[PDB]
Amino acid sequence: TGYDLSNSVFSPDGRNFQVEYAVKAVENGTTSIGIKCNDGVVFAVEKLITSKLLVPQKNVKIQVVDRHIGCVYSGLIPDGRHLVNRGREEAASFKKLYKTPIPIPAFADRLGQYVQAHTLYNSVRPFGVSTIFGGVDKNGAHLYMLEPSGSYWGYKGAATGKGRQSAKAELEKLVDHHPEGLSAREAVKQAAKIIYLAHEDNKEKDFELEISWCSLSETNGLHKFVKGDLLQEAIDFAQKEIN
Amino acid sequence: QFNPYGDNGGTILGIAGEDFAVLAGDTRNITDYSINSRYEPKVFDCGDNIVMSANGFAADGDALVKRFKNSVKWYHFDHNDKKLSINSAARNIQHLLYGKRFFPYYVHTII
Amino acid sequence: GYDRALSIFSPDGHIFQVEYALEAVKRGTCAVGVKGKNCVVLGCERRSTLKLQDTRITPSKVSKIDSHVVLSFSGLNADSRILIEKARVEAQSHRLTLEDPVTVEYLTRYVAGVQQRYTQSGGVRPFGVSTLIAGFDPRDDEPKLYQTEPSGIYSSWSAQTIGRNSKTVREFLEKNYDRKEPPATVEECVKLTVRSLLEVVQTGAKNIEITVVKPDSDIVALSSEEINQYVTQIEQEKQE
Amino acid sequence: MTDRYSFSLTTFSPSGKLGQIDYALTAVKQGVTSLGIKATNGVVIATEKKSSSPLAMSETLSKVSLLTPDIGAVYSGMGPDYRVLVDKSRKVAHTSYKRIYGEYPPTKLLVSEVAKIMQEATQSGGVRPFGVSLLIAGHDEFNGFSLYQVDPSGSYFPWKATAIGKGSVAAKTFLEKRWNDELELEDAIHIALLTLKESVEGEFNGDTIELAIIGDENPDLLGYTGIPTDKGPRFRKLTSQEINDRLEAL
Amino acid sequence: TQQPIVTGTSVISMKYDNGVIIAADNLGSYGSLLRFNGVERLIPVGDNTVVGISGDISDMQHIERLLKDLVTENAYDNPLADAEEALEPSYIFEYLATVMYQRRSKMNPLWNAIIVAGVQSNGDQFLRYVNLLGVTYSSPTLATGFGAHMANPLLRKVVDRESDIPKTTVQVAEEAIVNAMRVLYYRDARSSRNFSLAIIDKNTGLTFKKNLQVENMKWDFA
Amino acid sequence: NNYDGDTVTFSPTGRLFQVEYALEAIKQGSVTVGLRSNTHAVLVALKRNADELSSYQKKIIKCDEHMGLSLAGLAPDARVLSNYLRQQCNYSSLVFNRKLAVERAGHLLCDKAQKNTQSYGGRPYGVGLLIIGYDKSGAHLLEFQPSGNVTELYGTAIGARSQGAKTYLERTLDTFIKIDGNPDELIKAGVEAISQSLRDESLTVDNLSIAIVGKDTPFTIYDGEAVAKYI
Amino acid sequence: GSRRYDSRTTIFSPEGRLYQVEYALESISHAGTAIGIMASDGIVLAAERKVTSTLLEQDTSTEKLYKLNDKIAVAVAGLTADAEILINTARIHAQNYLKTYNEDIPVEILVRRLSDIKQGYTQHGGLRPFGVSFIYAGYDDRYGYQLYTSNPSGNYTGWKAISVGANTSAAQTLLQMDYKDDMKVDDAIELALKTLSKTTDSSALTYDRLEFATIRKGANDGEVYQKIFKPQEIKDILVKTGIT
Amino acid sequence: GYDRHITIFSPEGRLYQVEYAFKATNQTNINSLAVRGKDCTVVISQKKVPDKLLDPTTVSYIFCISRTIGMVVNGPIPDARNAALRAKAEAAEFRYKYGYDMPCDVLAKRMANLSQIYTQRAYMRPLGVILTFVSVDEELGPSIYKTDPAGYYVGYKATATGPKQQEITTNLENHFKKSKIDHINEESWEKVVEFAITHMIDALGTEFSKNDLEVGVATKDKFFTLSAENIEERLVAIAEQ
Amino acid sequence: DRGVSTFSPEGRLFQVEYSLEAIKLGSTAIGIATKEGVVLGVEKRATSPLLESDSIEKIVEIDRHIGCAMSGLTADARSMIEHARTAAVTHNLYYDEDINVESLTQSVCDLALRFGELMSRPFGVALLIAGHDADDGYQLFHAEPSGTFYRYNAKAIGSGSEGAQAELLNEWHSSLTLKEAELLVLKILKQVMEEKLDENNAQLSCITKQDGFKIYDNEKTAELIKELKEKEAAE
Numbered sequence A: 001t002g003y004d005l006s007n008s009v010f011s012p013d014g015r016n017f018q019v020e021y022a023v024k025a026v027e028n029g030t031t032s033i034g035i036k037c038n039d040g041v042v043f044a045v046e047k048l049i050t051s052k053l054l055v056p057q058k059n060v061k062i063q064v065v066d067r068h069i070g071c072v073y074s075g076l077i078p079d080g081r082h083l084v085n086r087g088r089e090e091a092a093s094f095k096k097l098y099k100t101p102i103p104i105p106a107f108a109d110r111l112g113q114y115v116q117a118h119t120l121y122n123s124v125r126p127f128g129v130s131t132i133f134g135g136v137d138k139n140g141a142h143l144y145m146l147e148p149s150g151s152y153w154g155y156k157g158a159a160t161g162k163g164r165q166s167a168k169a170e171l172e173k174l175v176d177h178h179p180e181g182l183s184a185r186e187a188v189k190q191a192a193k194i195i196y197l198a199h200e201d202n203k204e205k206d207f208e209l210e211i212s213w214c215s216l217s218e219t220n221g222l223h224k225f226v227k228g229d230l231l232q233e234a235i236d237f238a239q240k241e242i243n
Numbered sequence B: 001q002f003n004p005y006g007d008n009g010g011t012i013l014g015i016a017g018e019d020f021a022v023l024a025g026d027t028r029n030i031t032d033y034s035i036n037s038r039y040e041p042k043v044f045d046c047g048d049n050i051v052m053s054a055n056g057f058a059a060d061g062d063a064l065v066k067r068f069k070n071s072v073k074w075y076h077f078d079h080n081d082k083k084l085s086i087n088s089a090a091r092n093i094q095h096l097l098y099g100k101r102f103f104p105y106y107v108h109t110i111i
Numbered sequence C: 001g002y003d004r005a006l007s008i009f010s011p012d013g014h015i016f017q018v019e020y021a022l023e024a025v026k027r028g029t030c031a032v033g034v035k036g037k038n039c040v041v042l043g044c045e046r047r048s049t050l051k052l053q054d055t056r057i058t059p060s061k062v063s064k065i066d067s068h069v070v071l072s073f074s075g076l077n078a079d080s081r082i083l084i085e086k087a088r089v090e091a092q093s094h095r096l097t098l099e100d101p102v103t104v105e106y107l108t109r110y111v112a113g114v115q116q117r118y119t120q121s122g123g124v125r126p127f128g129v130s131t132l133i134a135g136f137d138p139r140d141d142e143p144k145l146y147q148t149e150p151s152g153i154y155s156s157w158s159a160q161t162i163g164r165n166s167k168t169v170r171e172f173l174e175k176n177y178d179r180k181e182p183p184a185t186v187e188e189c190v191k192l193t194v195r196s197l198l199e200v201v202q203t204g205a206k207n208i209e210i211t212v213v214k215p216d217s218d219i220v221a222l223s224s225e226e227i228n229q230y231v232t233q234i235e236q237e238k239q240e
Numbered sequence D: 001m002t003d004r005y006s007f008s009l010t011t012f013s014p015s016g017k018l019g020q021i022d023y024a025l026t027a028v029k030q031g032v033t034s035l036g037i038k039a040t041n042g043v044v045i046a047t048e049k050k051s052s053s054p055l056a057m058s059e060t061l062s063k064v065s066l067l068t069p070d071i072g073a074v075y076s077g078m079g080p081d082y083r084v085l086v087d088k089s090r091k092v093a094h095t096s097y098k099r100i101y102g103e104y105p106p107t108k109l110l111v112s113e114v115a116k117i118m119q120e121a122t123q124s125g126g127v128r129p130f131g132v133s134l135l136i137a138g139h140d141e142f143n144g145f146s147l148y149q150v151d152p153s154g155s156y157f158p159w160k161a162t163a164i165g166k167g168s169v170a171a172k173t174f175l176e177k178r179w180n181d182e183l184e185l186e187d188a189i190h191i192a193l194l195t196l197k198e199s200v201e202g203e204f205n206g207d208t209i210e211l212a213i214i215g216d217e218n219p220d221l222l223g224y225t226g227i228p229t230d231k232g233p234r235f236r237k238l239t240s241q242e243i244n245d246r247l248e249a250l
Numbered sequence E: 001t002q003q004p005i006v007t008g009t010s011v012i013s014m015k016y017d018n019g020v021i022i023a024a025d026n027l028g029s030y031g032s033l034l035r036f037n038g039v040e041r042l043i044p045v046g047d048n049t050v051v052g053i054s055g056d057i058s059d060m061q062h063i064e065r066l067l068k069d070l071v072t073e074n075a076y077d078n079p080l081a082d083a084e085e086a087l088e089p090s091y092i093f094e095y096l097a098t099v100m101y102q103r104r105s106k107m108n109p110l111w112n113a114i115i116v117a118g119v120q121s122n123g124d125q126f127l128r129y130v131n132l133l134g135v136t137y138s139s140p141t142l143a144t145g146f147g148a149h150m151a152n153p154l155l156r157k158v159v160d161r162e163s164d165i166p167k168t169t170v171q172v173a174e175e176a177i178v179n180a181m182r183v184l185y186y187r188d189a190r191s192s193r194n195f196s197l198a199i200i201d202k203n204t205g206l207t208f209k210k211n212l213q214v215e216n217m218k219w220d221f222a
Numbered sequence F: 001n002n003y004d005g006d007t008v009t010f011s012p013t014g015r016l017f018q019v020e021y022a023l024e025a026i027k028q029g030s031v032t033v034g035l036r037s038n039t040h041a042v043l044v045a046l047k048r049n050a051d052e053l054s055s056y057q058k059k060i061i062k063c064d065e066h067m068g069l070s071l072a073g074l075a076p077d078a079r080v081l082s083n084y085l086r087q088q089c090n091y092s093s094l095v096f097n098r099k100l101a102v103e104r105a106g107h108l109l110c111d112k113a114q115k116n117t118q119s120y121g122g123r124p125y126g127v128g129l130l131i132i133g134y135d136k137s138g139a140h141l142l143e144f145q146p147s148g149n150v151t152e153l154y155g156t157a158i159g160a161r162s163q164g165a166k167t168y169l170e171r172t173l174d175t176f177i178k179i180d181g182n183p184d185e186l187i188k189a190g191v192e193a194i195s196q197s198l199r200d201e202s203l204t205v206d207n208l209s210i211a212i213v214g215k216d217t218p219f220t221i222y223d224g225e226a227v228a229k230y231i
Numbered sequence G: 001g002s003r004r005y006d007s008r009t010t011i012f013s014p015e016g017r018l019y020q021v022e023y024a025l026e027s028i029s030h031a032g033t034a035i036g037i038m039a040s041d042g043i044v045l046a047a048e049r050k051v052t053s054t055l056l057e058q059d060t061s062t063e064k065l066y067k068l069n070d071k072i073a074v075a076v077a078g079l080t081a082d083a084e085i086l087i088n089t090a091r092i093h094a095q096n097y098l099k100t101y102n103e104d105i106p107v108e109i110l111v112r113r114l115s116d117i118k119q120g121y122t123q124h125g126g127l128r129p130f131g132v133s134f135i136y137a138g139y140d141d142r143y144g145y146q147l148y149t150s151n152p153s154g155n156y157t158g159w160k161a162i163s164v165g166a167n168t169s170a171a172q173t174l175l176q177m178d179y180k181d182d183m184k185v186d187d188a189i190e191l192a193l194k195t196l197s198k199t200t201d202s203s204a205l206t207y208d209r210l211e212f213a214t215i216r217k218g219a220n221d222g223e224v225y226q227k228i229f230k231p232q233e234i235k236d237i238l239v240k241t242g243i244t
Numbered sequence H: 001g002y003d004r005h006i007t008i009f010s011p012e013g014r015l016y017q018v019e020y021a022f023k024a025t026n027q028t029n030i031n032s033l034a035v036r037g038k039d040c041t042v043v044i045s046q047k048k049v050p051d052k053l054l055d056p057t058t059v060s061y062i063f064c065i066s067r068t069i070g071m072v073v074n075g076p077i078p079d080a081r082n083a084a085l086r087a088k089a090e091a092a093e094f095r096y097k098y099g100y101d102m103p104c105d106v107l108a109k110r111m112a113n114l115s116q117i118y119t120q121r122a123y124m125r126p127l128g129v130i131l132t133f134v135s136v137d138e139e140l141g142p143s144i145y146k147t148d149p150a151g152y153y154v155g156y157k158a159t160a161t162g163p164k165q166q167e168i169t170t171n172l173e174n175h176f177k178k179s180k181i182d183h184i185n186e187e188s189w190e191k192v193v194e195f196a197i198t199h200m201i202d203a204l205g206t207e208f209s210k211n212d213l214e215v216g217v218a219t220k221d222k223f224f225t226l227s228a229e230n231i232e233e234r235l236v237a238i239a240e241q
Numbered sequence I: 001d002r003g004v005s006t007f008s009p010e011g012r013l014f015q016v017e018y019s020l021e022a023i024k025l026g027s028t029a030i031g032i033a034t035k036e037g038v039v040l041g042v043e044k045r046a047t048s049p050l051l052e053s054d055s056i057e058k059i060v061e062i063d064r065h066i067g068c069a070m071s072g073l074t075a076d077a078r079s080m081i082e083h084a085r086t087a088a089v090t091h092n093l094y095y096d097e098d099i100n101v102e103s104l105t106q107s108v109c110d111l112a113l114r115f116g117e118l119m120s121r122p123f124g125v126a127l128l129i130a131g132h133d134a135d136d137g138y139q140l141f142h143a144e145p146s147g148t149f150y151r152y153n154a155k156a157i158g159s160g161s162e163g164a165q166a167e168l169l170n171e172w173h174s175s176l177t178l179k180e181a182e183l184l185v186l187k188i189l190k191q192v193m194e195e196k197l198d199e200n201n202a203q204l205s206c207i208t209k210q211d212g213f214k215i216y217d218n219e220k221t222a223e224l225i226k227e228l229k230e231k232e233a234a235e
């Protein structure tokens, strides 16, 4: 034994235990999700209200990269911010040289290679976050989810955090019941419901819902936060479904 | 060939009284035979009861005043909000100027 | 580069690498320094476990740092060369910039500074060397004798010894050296230095080295026969 | 990141042993047998092409490698370590010699450069020793024909004939009985094939054996004519057919 | 150190009672060759700022990309990016002025003269100049190159000092700007008939006018 | 246990023990309170002395005319982080002629602390910070943890026995948020909050440290007889 | 991180000894014995090759005796590969000195330089020391014929006669017994071979197990000649001295 | 026992971290196969999409390294993409420096050399992947060259990689023992793909739908991957005889 | 082993806490601040009678208006003193004035936590920094290897510190004269020292606005010791 004391060490199984321990930090975090719709993507996250003293709507979790990509993550929040800062540098250099905004699959690999690099050496620690991200490019909508190992795939729907099992089951129902697809406005409503349903794993404290979206028809392919009336409409729809 | 310097004209005047001091300057800014501005302030209140003007090449003038104002700010941070005396300010400005001895601020400074 | 902190504090507030460097000094051959009224004498032990040695070419235990200052040591021989070289370079650098040779205290302070630096720099171990630095300041006739150790502390001594069995010879010096009246001549000072080593040495043959430093860059090493005459006279007075 | 292993991974144990070098020699011992024999008018180096799979094309894996036109090399131990050493040896022959003197290095000096590289992997920070022993055969104008062994420690020795790897102890005894200072190159090849048969279990033919010689200049392999002083390489790898022809006279 | 290759001529501007006006023609000259005829030299930043640039066009395109990147960067982790924490004309100018002076200090200037025109959060007019030397100044009217010699005298007849600004309407100001552009077309050999004009008003916001032409020209007397 | 030797090692449950030990240093520190209204933001700090001959360790540091913080834990680490904030506030003013937003200041502090939690050789910061400020979106209060977690709040407290002050602020939330245009009453509420964390000792004239920033109020620190009015 | 795997090659023991230096000296004690003897008219270097083979090409082989320049040679005991690294550095130092001063490097200055390089590896860098002990045989016009030794600690000393490698305790006692100051090279040649013959772990001392060299002013007039003995010449001197 | 944590020799002369990297290679539970035709080189690999929430079009272990070179990977996707990016960078740099397209065997050697370095340098871990490079080389013709975590590489007539490599390998061995030639004697690549799929079905004892496979084909001057509908056409032809 | 910058479970840096133990083994140093000046005193503690005690330098001048006393591994103090002197002189060069005592102390304390894997370990020495400036008058600071510095009316460091500090607790008042402080340092040093206090094994110094920093002659201190003996025999 001792194989789990140092990053980048293969166990006799062929496993990197330090990466597996980073996953435990992700599983300990709040629930975040992503839904791929007809012409875009929707991101939503559970924000635990630890105290009344937290200013509502102020501690924003979802982050924008460039002007067309949204990112949300569960686990160690600072690690997620570090990853997004790198993503912003990657997107800037891509646009600087190639003029066009970074395509989503291209951006996905940039994050992937960077996270994977933190599993190659014992002088660094793996990322303690799973990141759900995506947006609209010239080939349409894309949704991705990226793990501590550096592993990522494209998704129809994605979920991570403490209530991921609940969320995944809900996402699977939507995929089955809508083979033709989901509209952006429908996806916002559904995202609100799924976070409310996934909040059963975190039922002790109450929470605040945060939603964002990129849609070709609804936001002109730019990332925007769901605010005011549209947010309240989604909260009402969600509260109706849990009762 | 690129000439990093220019001449923005202007004239400044400092006079020390018995218990007061004045620093005056015209408000005209020029290049060659043209007027850039009829009112471009050239004498500045830098805090701690110190007034300053760096006349000549206005870009270097603005840069120096800006760096001195900053030096006053950091003097307060580093030395328990102690007032920067005029003699201490003068020695500090010498080091700001001599720091660019081989690529000078093309200005005549008066505080 | 290799950056590992080798010299670190232990729970009881000790730096073991510095303390273990002193143990290397304890193992080294005995060195002794005695200052008279107008001279300083440096005595050194030569272990007679090594015969068939070529004494002409073998590194001598006392080293000139400048024409007016000398350095002897106890501990790791290879380590001492690095300190001696640095000191010699600094001595010439001082002459070049100040236009005056180093004082004995300044040279001591420098060597001690180098030793200290090696106790809180990454990737290095302390010197396993203690030194005795002796001489006369330029245009001064007051004798100077200083001691340094691996930790980097230094101080002035009327008489001092370092190395193996230095506890015994310090015992001798503490009861035989009078401060109100130091050895008034070269003879008396050399005699007291040879006497102190005879408490520890074994045979008074090629086991004792003696170097005399006088004011105005007057430094000379005594030969076997000259020292042998001191060894002879000491025991003939002892047979009584 | 940054390579933070700036310290030696090979160190002296209380008994005076350098563990990592000993263990590297153990890896060489497990390796397939290779040998070298020096004759009056040439040198031969040989080994078994132990194919990992019958679907693998073992001709694409070269165990015997040209270092210079007059110098060749074979190994026993870890193949990948050998391959990179061949790359470094080829380059150092140019950078530290041919680009300075306008001619290829003599065998002993190229061996010296390879040895230095292997020594440094035994002392430098954050690396393990190379897990190979090399046999280097060559010719140069002033030293004639020569054969050298280089070990993981960086130590090298000149041989009349020797063997390394799996069955080296038995092979060296076999070579001691057969070697003399009057052997012609064809005699050395014959002895090489006889010696190598003892350590080979399965098939023994031109497709399972790799064999090269350092001998006469080959003007037919030079690629150009017109310069009298340039007469072609002395290193030549024997073909599958050439080996089988000598296995009938075995 | 370099030399300008493809260049843009005068940028002219002035303050009026409720905001600022800025204008510049659509030509990219290659020495005396009138090479490129569809170059936009007024670049809006948000809905409160217009940056007018003359001089080297390759450096202008670089500055245009810096400003585009500035908007992207300001929006990062900024919930009030379209409200209280939006870019101000004063922020945009100070950034450019920093860049210009730094570049001249490395003896590698951006070979331009720039006028930043806009309206601040509190409704205050903003109009300030910066060039390849890092020299900055403000005035009720500002103009670069030939505009400094020919436009300023005409524009100063409308607003001669600070107290004339509240007395000057947007109609009078635009009229003065358009006339100045005609005069520059008569007399500047590196000018064109086609130009752009931008009005930034504290009430009606940013009005950007493209494909304007110099008209009502006199020649006859020849 | 076997996983607390350095900051580069996760435990089997996904914890970072060196960061948790750095968090423990804050709990040993002296109590400090932060609270705000819509016009002003206030810091109150209980200063700690070594003995009766010693001075009381300062707790509040000014970062700009519109921003500053209070500390709990390793004081030298607060000096490093406050120096960094001073520079970032200064960079914003010099380059952009723009006062640094309090929320952006929090993001910068988060990222600076994070780098010390993912790399070998380094250590986490051993201090907690309460940042108050007044910018273009009004009054603000932030809580910084050396884990990197920065949180915007109406009120809070950190240090030893901070739980008493935090519960009080949670009760008084609806009252003190409405104290607009009255600096003295907002400070009173903060002094009453920090009093819920005292045991055996009480607030004296060299014990108490107060800071305030607001609409027409530069960040100013009150010590000595300037806080006797509130005792 | 990486600290976990660091052996810390440059630390003191509680007794004030350098672990790696001590263990490197243990390694050297298993190397073939090398002997140096200084006479009034020259120096002798004699050394035993380690258990050889009949197939080893002896006449082109060198593992013990190396030329540093025309005036200075070394005998090696320890890791041969480590020794060659240091030898090449010493050869360069000698040439640097010759270029700078237009005079051949004095023996001690070369010895001090190599010894300082060894010392460095024991104090900084975190690398293992060189597992090598040298005997330096050389001549210069200041001190004449000189013998030195250096070991992995970087410490060096001067000698009239000295041994390194295996059985140095037995060898040094035998040398101490028969050495005299007025000795000549031909007498020293005999002493060196007799000492190796008695201390060797082999059954008998033969030419193929030896490397031999002399530094003589037996060079025609006011100059010095180095002689690295050939296999046949070692065979002849073994018969002459009556060992075979 | 730190000789098991970093790439230094064990007392037996073994490198355990290399051996354990070989074990990580089978973590995906995917088998791949490569064969050569007259004019082409075909590589097939199992495709498993276990989650319904996944976008199946993004799940792939076949990579287009250059116009001419394709690469299939056996091992975890993060290490696979690491190797893919590097191979693409190396191939592009080669063409820029030397003025011609990087050969398949030369790229394999280069990636093998990089892998060798990870087995010797302590600060770098081996990649837990086996890389099979395929092309139709302009000098050597149809080419298969495979690299592993030990830094070993060699050319193949045909090859197989994965948990059930032995079954596929023996099946391929038996076919080439019959035919006595080093390739599939077929004109069209379509039929070479059909051969490859048929013999994987025989060896594994499992049937495949269009979504259970992933196919890459190398021809002169281009490598390309087949769509699900191209594979379906292949499966239909196999079933119809 | 374990990092040099590691936190304990209690939230303390191991190396800093261990260096504090080394300081406890150091010779005693005492400082007393008055409105007439600050006094600094030290125990010399020579290891042998042959050691010339006036070569023991544990009280040091930083500038004309700032002095400093040390306790612990005194070799570590040399670079700290060098930095302090450079900082004092540099500030005068930049600002044509004396540097504040607090600012000087802060500059020294900035070095403290610059260790890791910069120097390889913390300093093993504590400093008493005493001085005068126009803004805050006579001041005494205690600079630790933690990077923390406290201002004190009076302070003792070294092996006899807790006994001495209890004594300073009782004796200090805001009306002490310079002469009263001198005798008080001598009295408390004599209490905690192993050997009997005299002018050769103890040293006094002071900083006043008029005369600046001064180390006392052995003859001057010897008189103050005689004055102390008589006033203690006076009741």
Ligand SMILES: [Cl-]
Binding pocket: H109, H110, H113, H114
């Ligand atoms: Cl390569």
Ligand SMILES: [Mg+2]
Binding pocket: H006, H007, H117, H118, H119, H120, H121, H122, H123, H124, H125, H126
């Ligand atoms: Mg490795």
